[PDB]
């Protein structure tokens, strides 16, 4: 039972770490989307290819 507990804890910690990295990437994309909504929908943009 100790061996199985150690294996399942390692697997679940790996899942949590990968979820944290994906959440950071998704938050960066959401910040970019919020900036695009604030600058291009609510006004006219002078930035090239933004």
């Amino acid at each position: 039972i100790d061996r199985l507990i150690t294996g399942r804890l390692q697997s679940l910690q790996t899942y949590v770490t990968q979820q944290l990295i994906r959440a950071a990437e998704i938050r960066a994309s959401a910040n970019l989307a919020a900036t695009k909504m604030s600058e291009c929908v609510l006004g006219q943009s002078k930035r090239v290819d933004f």
Partner: protein
């Protein structure tokens, strides 16, 4: 080693996960190189007179 490989098969899909993450890292670097330099549609040429 056959015995170590058969003992490694008793573990989970860890080495499928670590192989899948590094492939996603390696594919991402080509996207990084493509996003920066390949912004121009046609390969322009300069005139001979400079």
């Amino acid at each position: 080693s056959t015995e170590c490989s058969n003992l490694l098969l008793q573990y989970g899909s860890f080495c499928t996960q670590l192989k899948r993450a590094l492939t996603g890292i390696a594919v991402e670097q080509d996207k990084n190189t493509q996003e920066v330099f390949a912004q121009v549609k046609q390969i322009y040429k300069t005139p001979p007179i400079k």
